[PDB]
Design a protein around this ligand. Structure first.
Ligand SMILES: [Mg+2]
Ligand SMILES: [Mg+2]
Ligand SMILES: [Mg+2]
Ligand SMILES: [Mg+2]
Ligand SMILES: [Mg+2]
Ligand SMILES: [Mg+2]
Lengths: 113, 64, 93, 274, 348, 113
RNA sequence: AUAUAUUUUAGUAAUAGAUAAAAAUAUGUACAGUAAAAUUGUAAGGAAAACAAUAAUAACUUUCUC
RNA sequence: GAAAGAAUUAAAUUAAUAUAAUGGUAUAACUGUGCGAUAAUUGUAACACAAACGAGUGAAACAAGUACGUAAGUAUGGCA
């Protein structure tokens, strides 16, 4: 009927498939449904607020940069030129790592190079 | 001969019958059409017998 | 010639009744080369893993911070620089 | 059929008739997939995404600061040119195609607080070419992909036909999977930390790699996939293993911006940039 | 805690069921849902875990937001803006959501869903837009009741009709239905549910049922026929069922003549239109209007011309459509209309 | 020798009825291969894209702003009407039947169901 | 922990989306959508296998916010 | 100021159309999908086109029944 390789392929396929592995549908009572809706809506609102806060902050930073660069242009042309360069190949430093869940054994390195 | 002619005879026993063409080894062709003797849509079935290209009956019940 | 798994009749998922594939996943703790632990969701059943070779001990990811090995092991009593100076006369070439 | 003439009749009102809602056929389908009452419901925002949080906090501000060019105006792309009306044959003529290209190119905007570059989507294309002989290899590749991602793969089929490579048309051959949001972020984090350090001699992603507009890519060999922890935990379950292409799609206007963004997430870049 | 206060706020914003309210607001998931009436089913049921504390937090968050909105709402002077503020404050209230979703909107009980309350009215409007309004629009366009009678419609009020007096059965007519001559023998009952903010005391309404498809053999075309005409009707958000109780004999500009389609004349559209009156400033009370009853004719009726004359704006519509059956002759006889014509089966 | 001496006849595919021309129900206004002209007001279209009159009237060729880049043939019910008819005005309809003044005929018609 | 009995599971097989230019039901109807080429890339991949990306947002509605 | 939606504009019929070539087709006639598998049904067909006759073509309408569609309606085989 089937080889051992064929069997193992079928098993692998099954791992991915939804055939006889999935539970019943999540039914709720009307009160429960409402509670869920209120949880979700509030959360969504909170997320929107956070986005606006961050977005606003970014806008403020941009405005400050603009204000700075105009001033620099007014005062010292050479300094302005130096500031406003193409940073095409700018690379973030490899020490600035993505913050983990829990910290390492040695928290901070005081010596380098 | 690739496409043969057949006679579909009405199931409501009027005697009315309609003729159609099929491929030589096509499945048994039953169709519901108007029977004017009875004045309604009835089943038509092949009056004669003939050989068919035997397809394997696809199994929905997961075998073995 | 072509090796295949021959298909059965497909099961009709009705419109609206299609359900998203939520695979069974465990919360797995990865301890990296150093003691920094990180939680990640994973399909294989293992609550804890500790890694040997990671970005946190690779020189490319932190610049600021086995035949040769075999040779070192089995010529260890001799201790093999001074040795280079001894065995490097540059007249013959 | 009395005719094939398609011709949508005009209306006498501005109300937008959603035809789906007027039926009673698919009552489960009227609910959005986000809604709990739909069978298509899935918990989306299950836990705090770490890479995304990092981007929000540290990187995004830094990226904005990098990309500020003073009084930078919009750079319009190559577009379809109109004809000068110096002849009456120009009068209903289609426009001249773009200068260099056949297809039109997009406008490059100055980076401000709104349009800072960020990760949009990852796609993991795995086309196993031995599966022209063995269909089961495609299945194994798809499983591997699923294991790696925690996301449902989609089967790739042979779209073309060719004799030199023993390839038919309409044959299942490997799989793909578009990751988005938190799963994608996790996959990137795994790539940065676990897998790409265990490749022995890897300098980086090439600086000559990428789209012209905010898309960067690279690929992993069958040797490299054995470092993924789902694969890594058991060598025995995976005798065979398949390479893959990894298309990273950013919200970057240009490719150097996208490269910079990826560097922020600890992706090393080695080659000479364009 | 603004949503627990009911000093200034209406009673309708609360849930009237006590058990349901208790279930909503508890400190642990101990109680079982009032919705599940059966004991065995309650036993079987299991709500999702951790739902209570999070729900409480969400309530607090949205309650705070509502309170903040109310701080603005009371300072506001202009009425539409104030209403919008009120809506914003209370729309995310769980109790009002429960009330609206799970109790009838058509024949709303005032204590549960009060359409005097702005939030509930907004909810009702949204519900109407989701399905019933779209359906009505489709039936107007497909049947060709808009351009044939009255150019366009901008649906504002939800209009539902009924024929209670003829047969006995209770049924709200779905737009574009085929009703028997027995069903539509006696007059209908309207319900004009208004969702916009409008002056309830001043605003009057007119209702016109028009039959565009009565055949005129001189013209070799059709003509309109005003089958039923009411004017100067007073609506209120909750008190809105236009019945012989409400309107007086003075309000009837053309009293109900039934659908009596001729044999082979075809299917006849009867499309009720609901207009609101023009509102005059510097005049307290409801501004009436006089109709020249000799000028307007029933056997031929320019609806558009009439609208132009009295400066009406069509807010709502509904439509049924009648064709010939055996009982139309009986209906004619009852009303004292003539025998009724019979046309050739072929449209030659 | 070998000669290419073979060809089908011309399909008579002009306009069979012209602007301002009186028509009757069923009459073919256009024969064509594909919709060069689209079926306009009071006009049908056949299997061979043949425009035919649904009603008695006046054949009119026109453009409609609703369908730009499309020519139309329709049938105006009189000569007075500009057949790209006004959109929000009511549709000019033909009753097209006659009442059975004859008593017997009317009775027969009443009987027939 | 172990024995018997009575059951229950394991037949492990793909679509999870009204799917949308790999292949497959070529006539009806209902609902919905848009192709191709060329270009820039990417593990074996090379002119030629697969996947990604490549025209413009003025006005409008809703949501959050200064 | 931002997010989402509705979308609109430009371009396109160079792909695709069971099949030649031509005309048509994105408002899609092309493609996907649910139901279905019925209208690839039954009697009368006027009136046109074409046309020596024999034939050929489009087809309103009337009547019987069927399938899909919330409805409007559509279907008397296939874009021609
Ligand atoms: Mg020719
Ligand atoms: Mg062509
Ligand atoms: Mg002639
Ligand atoms: Mg002849
Ligand atoms: Mg077709
Ligand atoms: Mg075809």
């Amino acid at each position: 009927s089937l080889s051992p390789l064929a069997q193992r392929v079928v098993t692998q396929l099954s791992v991915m498939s939804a055939s006889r592995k999935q539970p019943k549908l999540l039914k709720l009572a009307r009160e429960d449904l409402i509670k869920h809706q209120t949880i979700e809506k509030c959360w969504s609102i909170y997320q929107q607020q956070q986005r606006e806060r961050r977005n606003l902050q970014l806008e403020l930073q941009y405005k400050s940069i603009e204000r700075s660069m105009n001033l620099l242009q007014e005062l010292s042309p050479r300094l302005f030129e130096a500031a406003n360069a193409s940073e095409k190949g700018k690379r973030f430093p490899m020490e600035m790592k993505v913050p983990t869940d829990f910290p390492p054994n040695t928290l901070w390195h005081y010596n380098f190079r | 001969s690739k496409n043969s002619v057949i006679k579909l005879l009405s199931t409501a026993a009027s005697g009315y019958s309609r003729y159609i063409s099929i491929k030589k080894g096509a499945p048994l062709v039953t169709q519901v059409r108007y029977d004017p003797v009875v004045k309604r849509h009835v089943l038509f079935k092949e009056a004669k017998k003939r050989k068919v290209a035997e397809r394997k009956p696809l199994d929905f019940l997961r075998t073995a | 010639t072509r090796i295949t798994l021959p298909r059965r009749p497909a099961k009709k998922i009705q419109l609206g009744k299609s359900r998203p594939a939520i695979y069974h996943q465990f919360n797995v703790k990865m301890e990296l080369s150093d003691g920094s632990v990180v939680i990640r969701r994973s399909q294989y059943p293992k609550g804890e893993i500790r890694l040997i070779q990671d970005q946190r001990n690779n020189p490319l990811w932190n610049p600021s911070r086995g035949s040769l090995d075999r040779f070192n092991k089995r010529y260890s009593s001799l201790f093999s620089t001074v040795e280079l100076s001894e065995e490097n006369k540059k007249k013959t070439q | 059929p009395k005719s094939a003439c398609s011709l949508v009749k005009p209306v006498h009102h501005l109300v937008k008739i959603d035809k789906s809602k007027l039926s009673p056929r698919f009552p489960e389908l009227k609910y959005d997939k986000s809604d709990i009452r739909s069978p298509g419901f899935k918990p989306k925002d299950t836990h705090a995404d770490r890479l995304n949080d990092h981007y929000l906090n540290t990187l995004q501000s830094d990226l904005l600061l990098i990309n500020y060019s003073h009084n930078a105006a919009v750079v319009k792309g190559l577009k379809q040119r109109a004809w000068s009306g110096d002849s009456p044959y120009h009068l209903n003529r289609p426009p001249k195609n773009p200068r260099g290209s056949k297809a039109q190119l997009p406008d490059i905007h100055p980076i401000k607080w709104s349009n800072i570059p960020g990760l949009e989507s990852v796609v993991i294309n795995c086309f196993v070419r031995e599966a022209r002989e063995n269909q089961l290899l495609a299945i194994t590749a798809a499983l591997q992909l699923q294991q790696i991602t925690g996301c449902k793969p989609h089967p790739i089929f042979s779209k073309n036909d060719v004799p030199t490579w023993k390839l038919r048309k309409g044959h299942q051959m490997g799989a793909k999977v578009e990751l988005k949001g938190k799963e994608m972020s996790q996959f990137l984090s795994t790539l940065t930390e676990i897998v790409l350090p265990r490749i022995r001699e890897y300098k980086g992603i090439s600086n000559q790699s990428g789209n012209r507009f905010g898309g960067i890519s690279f690929g992993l060999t069958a040797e490299d996939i054995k470092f993924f922890p789902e694969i890594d935990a058991n060598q025995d379950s995976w005798p065979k293993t398949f390479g893959m292409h990894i298309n990273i799609n950013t919200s970057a206007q240009l490719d150097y911006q996208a490269r910079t963004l990826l560097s922020g997430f600890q992706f090393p870049f080695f080659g000479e940039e364009k | 805690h603004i949503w627990s206060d009911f000093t200034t706020r209406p009673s309708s914003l609360s849930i009237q069921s006590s058990k349901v309210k208790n279930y909503l607001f508890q400190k642990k998931a101990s109680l079982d849902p009032p919705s599940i009436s059966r004991r065995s089913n309650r036993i079987k049921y299991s709500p999702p875990e951790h739902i209570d504390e999070i729900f409480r937090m969400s309530y607090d968050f949205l309650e705070q937001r509502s309170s903040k909105f109310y701080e603005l709402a009371n300072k506001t002077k202009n009425p539409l803006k104030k209403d919008a503020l009120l809506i914003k404050a209370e729309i995310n209230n769980p109790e009002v959501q429960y009330n609206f979703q799970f109790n009838n909107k058509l024949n709303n009980v005032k204590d549960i869903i009060d359409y005097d309350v702005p939030v509930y009215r907004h909810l009702g409007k949204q519900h109407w837009e989701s399905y019933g309004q779209m359906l009505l629009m489709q039936r107007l366009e497909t049947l060709a009741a808009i351009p044939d009678t009255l150019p366009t419609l901008v649906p504002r009020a939800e209009v539902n009709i009924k024929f209670p007096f003829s047969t006995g059965v209770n049924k709200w007519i779905e737009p574009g239905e085929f009703l028997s001559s027995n069903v539509t023998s006696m007059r209908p009952i309207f319900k004009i549910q208004e969702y916009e903010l409008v002056n309830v005391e001043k605003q009057l309404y007119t209702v016109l049922i028009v039959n565009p498809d009565v055949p005129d053999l001189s013209n070799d075309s059709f003509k309109t026929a005003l089958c039923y005409g009411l004017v100067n009707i007073n609506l209120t958000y909750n008190d809105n069922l236009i019945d012989p109780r409400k309107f007086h004999s003075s309000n009837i500009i053309a009293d109900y003549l039934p659908p009596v389609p001729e044999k082979n004349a075809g299917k006849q559209r009867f499309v009720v239109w609901v207009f609101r009156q023009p509102l005059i400033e510097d005049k307290q009370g409801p501004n009436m209007l006089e109709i020249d009853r000799k000028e307007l004719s029933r056997d031929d009726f320019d609806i558009r011309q009439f609208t132009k004359k009295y400066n009406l704006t069509a807010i709502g519509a509904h439509i049924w459509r009648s064709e010939w059956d055996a009982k139309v002759a009986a209906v004619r006889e009852k009303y004292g209309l003539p025998p009724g014509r019979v046309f050739s089966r072929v449209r030659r | 020798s070998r000669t290419s001496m073979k060809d089908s006849a011309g399909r008579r595919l002009g306009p069979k009825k012209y602007e301002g021309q009186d028509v009757s129900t069923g009459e073919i206004i256009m024969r064509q291969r594909g919709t060069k002209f689209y079926p306009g007001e009071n006009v049908g279209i056949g299997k061979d894209h043949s425009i035919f009159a649904l009603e008695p009237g006046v054949v009119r060729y026109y453009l409609d702003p609703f369908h730009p880049k499309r020519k139309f043939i329709g049938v105006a019910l009189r000569r007075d009407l500009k057949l790209p008819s006004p959109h929000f005005e009511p549709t000019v309809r033909r009753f097209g039947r006659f009442e059975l003044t004859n008593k017997r005929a009317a009775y027969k018609e009443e009987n027939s169901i």
